[PDB]
Symmetry: C3
Subunit: 123 residues, 3 copies
Amino acid sequence: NEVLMAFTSYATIILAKMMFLSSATAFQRLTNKDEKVERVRRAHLNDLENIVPFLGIGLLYSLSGPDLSTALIHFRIFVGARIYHTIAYLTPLPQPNRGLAFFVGYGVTLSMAYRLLRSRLYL
Amino acid sequence: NEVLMAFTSYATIILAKMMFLSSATAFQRLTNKDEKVERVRRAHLNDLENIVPFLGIGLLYSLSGPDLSTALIHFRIFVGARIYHTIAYLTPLPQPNRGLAFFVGYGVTLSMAYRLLRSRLYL
Amino acid sequence: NEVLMAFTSYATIILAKMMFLSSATAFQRLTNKDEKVERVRRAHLNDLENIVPFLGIGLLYSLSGPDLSTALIHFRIFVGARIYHTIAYLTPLPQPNRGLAFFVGYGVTLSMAYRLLRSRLYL
Ligand SMILES: CCCCCCCCCCCCCCCCCC(=O)OC[C@@H](COP(=O)([O-])OCC[N+](C)(C)C)OC(=O)CCCCCCCCCCCCCCCCC
Ligand SMILES: CCCCCCCCCCCCCCCCCC(=O)OC[C@@H](COP(=O)([O-])OCC[N+](C)(C)C)OC(=O)CCCCCCCCCCCCCCCCC
Ligand SMILES: CCCCCCCCCCCCCCCCCC(=O)OC[C@@H](COP(=O)([O-])OCC[N+](C)(C)C)OC(=O)CCCCCCCCCCCCCCCCC
Ligand SMILES: CCCCCCCCCCCCCCCCCC(=O)OC[C@@H](COP(=O)([O-])OCC[N+](C)(C)C)OC(=O)CCCCCCCCCCCCCCCCC
Ligand SMILES: CCCCCCCCCCCCCCCCCC(=O)OC[C@@H](COP(=O)([O-])OCC[N+](C)(C)C)OC(=O)CCCCCCCCCCCCCCCCC
Ligand SMILES: CCCCCCCCCCCCCCCCCC(=O)OC[C@@H](COP(=O)([O-])OCC[N+](C)(C)C)OC(=O)CCCCCCCCCCCCCCCCC
Ligand SMILES: N[C@@H](CCC(=O)N[C@@H](CS)C(=O)NCC(=O)O)C(=O)O
Ligand SMILES: N[C@@H](CCC(=O)N[C@@H](CS)C(=O)NCC(=O)O)C(=O)O
Ligand SMILES: N[C@@H](CCC(=O)N[C@@H](CS)C(=O)NCC(=O)O)C(=O)O
């Protein structure tokens, strides 16, 4: 429960996230058309891989999530970090393609990656 | 069972799908060589992400799939939609890179995404 | 256990793998800068998809992994194949982008893909 509770919710978000944004980018791509080209391309793949390792990591301490400890918060903020980070980006075809923005997204993937990873594993 | 039954099968397909097609594209890429360049590149990533969110969504109502309701059919046709959709595409390096074809694939990802997602979640 | 044991470990590796390598490439990309451009781009996506289907396949005989038979070894060497394969590659922006190296990585994905896939499925 506690467990299912966690994963679905994060992912659902995550997947409302990645979902609007995917078809959406598709939809805008053709609609914009071009700068928006990479913009859209761009959203997909950073995010697609935000998710891609989200998926690795979440999905797994998922079904290996024994300890009672509260860790979902990061499942939760890493989402929270990464969304506003893309969203912050968020149209500049010029590099920078990054910023404090992703010092948030990636780097939280990193922190919440790092701890929780190690956590349900070594236990 | 009913459950395992579902996921493996869809994925197996899905993964026979994504699998021939991956090494295959590799194999053809070098063999064609060039137009086939993006063609192959092309197959991977639409499909790679067909799968990528397949994976998100399937995999999860997977292990959160309680209701008796018949929903696998779409696991099943969204595959059925997406394969023939790429396959329909399926060599034009000119945009369009889409069509009624993906009005099928993506959009079923969308429908079968949308309902089943919400379904085992809100329950 | 035996099961959890398996998946986490492979993935952890896999995910220490894909993880250093992702932020890392990011980090080097900006730092190199350019040839390193595709190099880094390059690492991500072969590997990102090494993982991408790893994820499909591992993750699933994962929770459908009944037989006692020893199959983790490949979870294990396919990792072992693929790492040293990228790593072998591993800076040439000239094609070849492949070699005996990936005759290892991909092709083990293939062998260990192929058998274990079929195995916990048909059972
Ligand atoms: C609950 C907390 C108690 C107190 C709350 C009070 C907090 C109030 C914060 C007030 C802030 C004051 C504003 C100063 C900021 C100026 C920033 C700036 O100049 O831009 C930098 C710019 C710099 O831009 P740039 O010029 O480098 O590039 C832009 C791109 N070009 C140039 C191509 C156009 O960086 C960004 O754009 C980042 C975007 C920030 C987006 C912020 C929106 C998200 C905020 C989330 C939190 C909000 C509440 C959610 C709560 C939900 C509740 C559960
Ligand atoms: C943008 C900036 C960068 C962002 C990148 C990523 C984010 C980085 C995160 C960094 C780590 C932050 C550290 C916080 C934790 C440190 C505190 C600590 O250790 O104290 C002990 C811990 C543990 O609790 P305790 O140990 O004090 O309690 C003792 C009770 N016994 C021993 C009997 C069990 O305290 C907490 O952290 C509690 C925090 C709870 C969070 C607040 C919400 C609780 C309510 C739940 C529902 C609320 C709705 C929210 C839903 C959100 C919807 C979107
Ligand atoms: C069981 C049902 C009862 C009745 C079955 C009877 C159904 C019989 C349907 C007969 C159809 C009549 C044909 C008219 C169609 C003409 C289409 C056309 O012109 O092409 C559009 C074209 C338009 O092309 P275009 O010109 O825009 O671009 C092509 C690309 N260039 C130009 C670069 C070369 O679009 C497509 O290519 C789509 C490809 C369609 C592929 C169809 C094969 C898959 C069909 C799956 C179902 C088959 C059975 C599976 C059953 C399994 C059983 C469990
Ligand atoms: C290319 C075009 C776009 C494609 C994109 C994606 C596809 C879009 C899908 C859109 C939705 C379609 C709606 C269909 C459902 C609506 C019907 C409905 O609501 O009625 C009630 C529902 C529910 O059943 P019921 O409620 O009528 O039964 C009552 C019994 N009690 C109450 C006691 C439990 O009926 C059905 O849908 C039954 C359909 C079953 C499907 C037919 C096959 C059954 C046999 C199984 C094995 C067959 C082998 C197949 C293997 C395939 C291999 C590849
Ligand atoms: C335990 C076993 C018992 C015996 C152990 C004894 C084994 C000892 C093997 C000794 C080998 C002798 C060396 C001859 C090889 C020459 C290769 C060559 O020329 O390069 C080809 C080259 C050809 O290069 P190229 O010229 O086509 O392209 C390079 C790119 N450019 C040109 C752009 C610069 O291919 C490679 O680079 C492949 C890289 C190989 C990397 C090997 C390191 C990994 C080895 C893993 C095993 C090690 C132990 C791990 C054990 C862990 C324990 C649990
Ligand atoms: C770079 C080159 C390409 C690489 C690409 C991918 C790799 C390709 C792999 C190809 C397949 C290789 C075939 C090997 C198996 C064939 C042998 C066989 O069938 O015999 C019967 C099998 C089965 O056992 P058995 O059937 O003989 O035992 C009988 C006992 N009863 C019947 C009662 C149950 O034997 C084995 O394979 C045992 C091998 C075990 C592996 C050795 C290690 C065991 C110790 C565990 C801990 C060690 C630490 C290691 C951790 C690693 C850390 C990173
Ligand atoms: N989907 C791509 C995203 C790559 C990307 O957007 N790279 C950014 C940094 S994370 C960059 O600076 N690219 C170089 C460029 O735009 O020229 C991947 O997985 O590699
Ligand atoms: N793998 C790429 C696929 C992108 C792609 O093929 N985009 C299509 C629409 S879905 C397109 O029209 N691209 C613009 C172009 O080809 O110039 C991604 O995930 O973004
Ligand atoms: N992430 C890309 C990787 C594609 C790639 O690196 N292709 C290699 C073979 S696996 C190649 O030879 N590309 C053609 C080129 O570099 O011009 C994908 O998923 O398609």
